[PDB]
């Protein structure tokens, strides 16, 4: 009659590509845990005390206990050698940036303007303010990163800014993808 | 061609 | 907590019981590959071009499934547990793209914290109901075991239109709704 | 002529800013902008649209998320779970909607409350005691309540527990004294301190 919740999923940690590699696996019930088995363990172990007899249930298959083990170079090694190395790994999305401002109605007036980044992959960009040929910071105000989900990242950056005559501002991103840095510029 | 993905496999715990 | 270069979640399987509630997806650093159709047989991608360059056998999804709904058959009678309360979610409306009136445009409906995953998410074009463009996203997992999802919706952006959100959950004492207008800005 | 609000590390703060008190169409009020910059004695630490979309100062906010259901009650309050011991500064408000706005504005200090004992260390069988539970503020409380052991059971003035200038005393500690115990404090603000302390006796 009552509700109840129950989440399986395996996790593989990559570094540097295939030089090292976890592989870690977990068992949800209840947005809780109760067993785990870790590459770096070699064994089922129990989270709580719920799933001991489980755990060592498991540990009393030793075929089924190699499968697991061996697991890491069948699934994960291989699909990053494999399917993530012919789709994800190379896929890149290069960002969208405007320059925009809201707040403002007269001229000569303190403000802050935006600076918008949508619709770029992967997530590893920085994003920095540029008045006249220097790299501003101060009273900077920004998104954090922003997951659009549908296999893009956006992040939005504000600069407090002083409209003083004869001035470029520029918004300057670099990016993997981005083979050469972007600049958008704005003035008065 | 293509590549398959190979999948995790779960376990089942007895009654 | 743990860190590493790129991490791939494959295999997703969430049971709800009663009423068989299954969910089978493949998730790559917090973004999802592809999600298996429970009846229909089917993988479905979230992106087209990579199901032309890679094929899951969906049968394997599915024992996953039985397994899981075989463990959790196990674990409901072996204990006499209460259940989670359930939590209220957060939401926040948003653009896919900056803002232009007249320019189409997808508007997304992201929640995080749905728990349980049980939840109706539509939209109101000026507090009347639309359901014209909208993608039912498959729900997705964080590392502290809540689950968020999304929702898009094409639309033409107009002062006089106001759009929002809609949540109908199970731990909502109400059904709430975020107001966002391109007419505030 | 800027107020100022005291805060005690370790537990949140409270800083709300509503307009006034009347009753509003909710579907208007859900069309306001709020923005908020920090200057130490930080600038738009944390700015939301309508729209929900958290932007703000480069670093993530210490779990600094406001009430969903404030901001649809006529309420802009801000609710840090940790209060910093850095966030001590000057604070102001931005708050933007179709018809009218407001934009308040305080001061924020940091008041590390905690209770110091004369005897430092554990207790004998038979010896007086003192403690001493205070914020580092210069007003002096208004009224003092202390409290005895894990049910929280109110601390009284007694032959044997003496009180004064939130000063406690036991001249002879019997084993039974042993438990936390733990002060309440108030002031003219309503600033309210629940510190306790574990006694050790013999
Ligand atoms: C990372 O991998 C590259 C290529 O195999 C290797 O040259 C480099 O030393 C590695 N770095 C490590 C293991 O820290
Ligand atoms: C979602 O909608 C269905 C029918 O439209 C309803 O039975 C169900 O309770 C809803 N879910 C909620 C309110 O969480
Ligand atoms: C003791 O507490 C009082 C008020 O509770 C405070 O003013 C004082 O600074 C504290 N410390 C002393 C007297 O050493
Ligand atoms: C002190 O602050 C408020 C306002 O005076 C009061 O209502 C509350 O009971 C006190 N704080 C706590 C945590 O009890």
């Not at chain 1, 499968?67 to 890491?72: P, S, V």
């Not at chain 1, 990242?153 to 002083?162: A, D, G, I, R, W």
Request: hydrophobic share 35%.
């Amino acid at each position: 009659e009552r509700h109840f919740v129950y989440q399986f999923m395996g996790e593989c940690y990559f570094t540097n590509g295939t030089q090292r590699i976890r592989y870690v696996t977990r068992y949800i019930y209840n947005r809780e845990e109760y067993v785990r088995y870790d590459s770096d363990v070699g064994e089922h172990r129990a989270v709580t005390e719920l799933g001991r007899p489980d755990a060592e249930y498991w540990n009393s298959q030793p075929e089924i206990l190699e499968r697991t083990r061996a697991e890491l170079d069948t699934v994960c090694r291989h699909n990053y050698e494999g399917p993530e190395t012919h789709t994800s790994l190379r896929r890149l999305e290069q960002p969208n940036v405007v320059i925009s401002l809201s707040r403002t109605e007269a001229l000569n007036h303190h403000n802050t303007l935006v600076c918008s980044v949508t619709d770029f992959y992967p997530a590893k960009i920085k994003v920095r303010w540029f008045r006249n040929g220097q790299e501003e910071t101060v009273g900077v105000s920004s998104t954090q990163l922003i997951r659009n989900g549908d296999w893009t990242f956006q992040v939005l950056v504000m600069l407090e800014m002083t409209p003083r005559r004869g001035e470029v501002y520029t918004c300057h991103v670099e990016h993997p993808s981005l083979k050469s840095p972007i600049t958008v510029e704005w003035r008065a | 061609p293509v590549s398959k993905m190979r999948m995790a496999t779960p376990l089942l715990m007895q009654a | 907590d743990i860190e590493a270069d790129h991490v791939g979640t494959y295999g997703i399987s969430v049971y709800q019981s009663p009423g068989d509630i299954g969910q089978y997806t493949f998730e790559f650093d917090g973004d999802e590959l592809f999600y298996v159709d429970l009846d229909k047989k089917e993988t479905v991608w979230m992106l087209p071009e990579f199901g032309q360059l890679a094929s899951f056998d969906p049968q394997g999804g599915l024992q996953n499934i039985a397994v899981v709904k075989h463990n959790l058959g196990v674990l409901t009678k072996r204990s006499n547990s209460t259940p989670a309360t359930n939590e209220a979610p957060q939401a926040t409306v948003f653009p896919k793209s900056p803002v232009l009136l007249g320019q189409p445009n997808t508007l997304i409906c992201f929640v995080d914290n749905i728990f349980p995953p049980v939840i109706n998410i539509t939209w109101l074009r000026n507090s009347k109901s639309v359901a014209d463009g909208v993608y039912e996203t498959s729900f997705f997992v964080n590392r502290d075991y809540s689950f968020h999802k999304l929702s898009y919706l094409t639309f033409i952006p107009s002062d006089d239109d106001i759009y929002d959100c809609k949540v109908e959950h199970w731990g909502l004492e109400e059904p709430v709704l975020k107001h966002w207008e391109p007419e505030i800005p | 002529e800027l107020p100022v609000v005291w805060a005690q590390e370790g537990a949140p703060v409270h800083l709300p800013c509503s307009l006034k008190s009347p009753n509003l169409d909710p579907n208007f009020l859900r069309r306001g902008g709020v923005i908020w910059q920090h200057q130490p004695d930080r600038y738009t630490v944390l700015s939301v649209a309508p729209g929900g979309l958290r932007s703000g100062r480069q670093p993530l906010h210490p779990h600094v998320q406001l009430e969903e259901r404030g901001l649809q009650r006529g309420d802009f309050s801000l609710w840090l779970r940790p209060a910093l011991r850095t966030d001590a500064g000057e604070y102001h408000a931005t708050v933007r909607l179709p018809n009218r706005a407001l934009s308040c504005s305080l001061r924020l200090r940091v008041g590390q409350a905690s209770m110091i004992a004369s005897p430092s260390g554990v207790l004998k069988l038979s010896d007086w005691v003192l403690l001493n539970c205070s914020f580092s503020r210069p007003d002096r409380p208004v009224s003092v309540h202390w409290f005895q052991g894990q049910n929280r059971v109110p601390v009284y003035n007694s032959p044997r527990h003496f009180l004064a200038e939130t000063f406690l005393l036991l001249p002879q500690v019997s084993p039974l004294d042993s438990g936390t115990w733990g002060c309440v404090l108030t002031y003219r603000d309503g600033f309210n301190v629940s510190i306790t302390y574990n006694l050790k006796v013999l």
